[PDB]
Amino acid sequence: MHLNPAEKEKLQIFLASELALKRKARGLKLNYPEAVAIITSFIMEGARDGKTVAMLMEEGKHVLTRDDVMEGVPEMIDDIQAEATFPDGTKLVTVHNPIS
């Protein structure tokens, strides 16, 4: 596979996101690390899909809403940042105030 250090670490994000999505599917309000994991994995999978940085800056604001998360979680998350390999190489995505 020839995994580099970043590829190994970022598998962890996907896994945390899968864990969080199972918790959301059985009716739990998500916590801080759960919410961050879901939005982060969403950005990385969007880059893999070939979306633009601009598309993911918009979409990342609509992945989870206030009523998906515990009290205070929206205000704890000022922004989520992820780097992924786009068709044109690694780019940084910052999603501002992802949960309104």
């Binding site: 596979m1 020839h2 580099n4 250090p5 970022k10 390999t85 190489g89 690694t90």
Partner: protein, 570 residues
């Protein structure tokens, strides 16, 4: 007996006139010459040539022209040439490039390249071998950054920082004698070569100079510490006395001066201009004009490399979030618009292609990617071939000229700029055995094996519980060169002449090889290999248009790059 060229290349790697594709790019390198004697190629294994009385000499002791290590059948890609040779290593240094084996029975054996009882063998047949990358813009922020750099073929980190302190998160600076001593001690555990930059700021000489005497290898001038005429002047006065290099990130804000004021403070003295395009920092909007001057050694950082459809959206947002700038404050938007410019980023691709920007670097963890200096160098060369065509200087339909121009940007040129090219930066006899083996399908993407001081430090290798080393999962792993006390012999700490003369290594108990920084003050742009062009660069203050020889330098951003989604899991 004759061997057809396909079978010959499959067995021994390519020979004269054969071409190899670099990863999934359009770039082809061609073997220019071959040191072998056909039929006497060295190789190792069951019934192979390097056996006692045959291609291995059974007579000579290690001192008697015998190697510690032979890399067989390497395709070398270096500023010095693209060619086929055996590489002989002894005492951690490259001692011979030529033909290895046994003069008893073989023709054409390079006299100091005897395979003997003392010789280890690495098979490089079908590999490309380069010098380790020399990254001269490293922020020491997160020690996990070292494996990232090794995985993309970087073997030397020059820069500064104390970990994730704000000063270090912004600037390549280890400030003052105490922080320098602490980071020289930390360096004892980092499996990569290192040189530390002090703070290039002060209005008195003594506060600056005491960093050089403490063991700094150079200085960094950064606008966040005040890139004022005084700080520039004192840093270059220290550097001229101490024989170390000065890097500059100039006054983006033009607060104390415009570019012409910074150049007047420099006063014709040698300086390394970091991220010369200016997205990473510098006089808005014209800093890139530095790259035209004979006393400037100009480098790019990697996130602008090359110009892509996501580049501007990514950079504008990164700059706003990292500076806590507000989209609804017009001074903040004006600043961002003055700093992140498609006109200068597009021209930066072409200035690399023309040999006007001499060097690449990362800006690791401050505004750049620790593991993408080599990667983005080749993506840039590939984009330029697609948009500008083969360069005029090319022959045989090969990209050898472009490949030597680009490999020089992250190997020999940074080493020359820093005063360390006597030790590292190229595959030449007499230099430290920092070597990177690449499978051509992974060239510039993921290193196969990274050799540090003649011992493998890092490798893509599989299951440690398996019968053989290749079963999954194959991933980058630290090797024996990084373990125990061997980390001391396989890596160099680069230091000022004065700190070495004053016994800093003994005072701090440093066990690493100590490298001397020297010959940094009477070089210039003319000393940059394949990248020596001086010219008047004009940057229009209204449109940010870049002109060289009366011609606008512009190109399109690309939607896709090679060395990207075919290779990476994220």
């Amino acid at each position: 007996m004759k061997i057809n060229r396909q079978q010959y290349a499959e067995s021994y790697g390519p020979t004269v006139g054969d071409q190899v594709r670099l990863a999934d790019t359009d770039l082809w390198i061609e073997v220019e010459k071959d040191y072998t004697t056909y039929g006497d190629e060295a190789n190792f294994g069951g019934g192979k040539v390097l056996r006692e009385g045959m291609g291995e000499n059974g007579t000579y002791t290690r001192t008697e022209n015998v190697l510690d290590l032979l890399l067989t059948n390497a395709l070398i890609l270096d500023y010095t040439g693209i060619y086929k040779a055996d590489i002989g290593v002894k005492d951690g240094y490259i001692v011979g490039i030529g033909k290895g084996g046994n003069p008893d029975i073989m023709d054409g054996v390079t006299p100091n390249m005897i395979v003997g009882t003392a010789t280890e063998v690495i098979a490089a047949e079908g590999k490309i071998v380069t010098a380790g990358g020399i990254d001269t813009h490293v922020h020491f922020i997160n020690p996990d950054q070292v494996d990232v750099a090794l995985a993309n073929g970087i073997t030397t980190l020059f820069g500064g920082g104390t970990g994730p302190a704000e000063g270090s998160k912004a600037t390549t600076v280890t400030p003052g004698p105490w922080n320098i001593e602490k980071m020289l001690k930390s360096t004892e555990g980092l499996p990569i070569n290192v040189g530390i930059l002090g703070k290039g700021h002060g209005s008195s000489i003594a506060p600056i100079m005491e960093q050089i005497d403490a063991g700094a290898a150079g200085l960094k001038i950064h606008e966040d510490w005040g890139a004022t005429p005084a700080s520039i002047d004192r840093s270059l006065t220290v550097a001229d006395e101490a024989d170390v290099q000065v890097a500059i990130h100039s006054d983006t804000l033009n607060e104390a001066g415009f570019l012409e004021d910074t150049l007047r403070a420099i006063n014709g003295r040698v300086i390394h201009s970091f991220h010369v395009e200016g997205a990473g920092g510098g006089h808005a909007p014209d800093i890139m004009a530095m790259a035209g001057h004979p006393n400037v050694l100009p480098s790019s950082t990697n996130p602008t490399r090359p110009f892509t459809v996501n580049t501007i959206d990514e950079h504008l947002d990164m700059l706003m979030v990292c500076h806590h700038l507000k989209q609804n404050i017009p001074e903040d938007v004006a600043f961002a618009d003055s700093r992140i410019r498609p006109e200068t980023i597009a021209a930066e691709d072409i200035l690399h292609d023309l040999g006007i920007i001499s060097m690449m670097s990362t800006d690791a963890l401050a505004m750049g990617r620790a593991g993408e200096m080599v990667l983005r160098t080749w993506q840039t060369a590939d984009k330029m071939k697609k948009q500008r065509g083969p360069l005029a200087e090319e022959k045989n339909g090969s990209d050898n000229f472009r490949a030597k121009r680009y490999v020089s940007k992250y190997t020999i040129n940074p080493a020359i700029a820093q005063g360390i090219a006597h030790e590292v930066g190229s595959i030449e006899e007499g230099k430290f055995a920092d070597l990177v083996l690449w499978e051509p399908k992974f060239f510039g993407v993921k290193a196969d094996r990274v050799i540090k001081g003649g011992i493998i430090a890092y490798a893509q290798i599989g299951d440690p519980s398996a019968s053989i080393p290749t079963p999954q999962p194959v991933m980058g792993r630290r090797m024996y060169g990084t373990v125990g006390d061997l980390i001391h012999d396989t890596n160099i700490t680069f230091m000022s002449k004065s700190s070495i003369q004053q016994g800093v290594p003994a005072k701090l108990g440093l066990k690493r090889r100590i490298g001397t920084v020297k010959n940094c003050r009477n070089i210039g742009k003319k000393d940059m290999k394949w990248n020596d062009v001086t010219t008047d660069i004009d940057i229009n203050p209204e449109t940010y248009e870049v002109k060289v020889d009366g011609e606008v330098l512009t190109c399109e951003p690309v939607k896709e790059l090679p060395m990207a989604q075919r290779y990476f899991l994220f």
